[PDB]
Design a protein around this ligand. Structure first.
Ligand code: HEM
Length: 339
């Protein structure tokens, strides 16, 4: 509790995941089919859906839809394992090998494939939940406990165990350049990330909200979350944000539900902290959130949560097959053709 204010007394409760002692890693896989029309993605999305039901499949998996650049959409699965060896065995399963790593994607194909697989060391991971909710990413399969370590600037860092001994910094005084345009269509590309990047999934869940809370969330809060994410996508150098996606979650059948989340990679957790604490875009969000809590008596069915991880280069595998150049990590760092 290095950053906790003196006599800290949070006003709102919060919960955080408490991992069992035999758990050393969480595998968080984002797998995306990229298309201009969802009909072209239908066949791929069927094969992958069945693969998640294998005995070696993820402990939990969400679907989400992302509207990306230039009319291209990403149909994404967000899949979790609590054992890397089980995930490795799922990949090697022959049904998965039919489509893994864009194997079905030709160089003249109308769809793209991408995957960003992060193997998260547990001491480099933390979660926060506005309520005792068992349907928030890892809280589907990991118990959560009440925490006082929240509601101050630095609490995220303090909730992450390794920050007791590590600064988690990126190189001093250096920034992301302007994004570079790659010739990524028709190619199988691999990107190598630097050490200590920070990945956040921060989520909004209003499916249990009544008439009043839903109108206030859609009308007041969501517009500024969108503005936040748009700003982040367009100001990589200034913010340190490598990649930011606002996605809307879907049923197994792909119908949109009243849930969204932002998935962002940052050059370091300090970059994420500086944006969150000092930028007006989020200051705005936090301000329309308290203005919504003032319109409904600070009694909320809205549910928020986030998962934050700090990754070494070798913890994350970034593969883009026949993808648009602005996808994910493609505009930054070292790209390599896969043979
Ligand atoms: C691009 C979207 C967002 C990003 C990247 C983001 C990021 C963060 C981060 C990193 C923190 C922890 C800061 C720290 O502990 O030092 C935080 C805290 C917080 N955020 Fe956001 N957030 C986003 C959207 C939202 C939304 C949509 C809401 C509410 C509707 C929100 C409300 C809050 C609140 C209330 C806290 C305080 C949590 C606590 O009790 O510690 N944020 N956010």
């Amino acid at each position: 509790m290095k950053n906790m204010p003196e006599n800290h007394n949070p006003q709102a409760n919060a919960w955080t995941a408490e991992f069992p002692p035999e758990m050393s890693y969480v595998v968080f896989a984002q797998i995306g089919i990229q298309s201009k029309s969802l009909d072209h993605a239908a066949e791929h999305l069927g094969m992958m859906k069945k693969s998640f039901d294998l005995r070696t499949g993820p402990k939990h998996v969400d679907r989400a839809l992302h509207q990306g650049a230039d009319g291209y959409q990403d149909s994404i699965f967000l899949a979790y394992w609590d054992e890397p060896a089980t995930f490795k065995s799922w990949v090697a399963d022959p049904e998965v090998q039919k489509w893994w790593s864009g194997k079905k994607i030709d160089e003249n194909s109308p769809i793209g494939y991408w995957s960003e697989v992060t193997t998260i060391p547990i001491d480099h991971f933390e979660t926060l939940h506005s309520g005792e909710n068992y349907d928030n990413g890892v809280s589907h399969f990991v118990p959560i406990k009440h925490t006082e370590v929240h509601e101050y600037w630095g609490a995220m860092r303090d909730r992450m165990p390794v920050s007791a001994s590590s600064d988690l910094e990126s190189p001093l005084g250096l920034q992301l350049p302007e994004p570079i345009v790659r010739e990524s269509f028709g190619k199988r590309l691999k990107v190598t990330a630097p050490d200590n990047i920070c990945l956040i999934r921060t989520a909004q869940n209003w499916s249990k909200c009544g008439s009043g809370e839903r109108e206030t969330y859609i009308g007041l809060v969501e517009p500024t979350l969108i503005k936040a994410n748009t700003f982040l996508r367009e100001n990589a150098s200034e913010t340190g944000c490598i990649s930011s996606k606002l996605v809307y979650e879907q049923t197994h059948d792909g119908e949109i539900v009243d849930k969204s989340c932002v998935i962002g990679y940052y050059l370091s957790m300090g970059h994420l902290e500086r944006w969150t604490h000092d930028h007006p875009t989020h200051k705005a969000i936090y301000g329309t959130f308290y203005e919504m809590l003032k319109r409904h008596d600070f009694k909320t069915e809205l549910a928020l949560w986030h998962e934050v991880s700090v990754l070494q280069s070798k913890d994350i595998e970034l593969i883009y097959v026949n993808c648009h150049p602005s996808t994910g990590f493609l505009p930054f760092f070292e790209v390599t053709e896969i043979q």
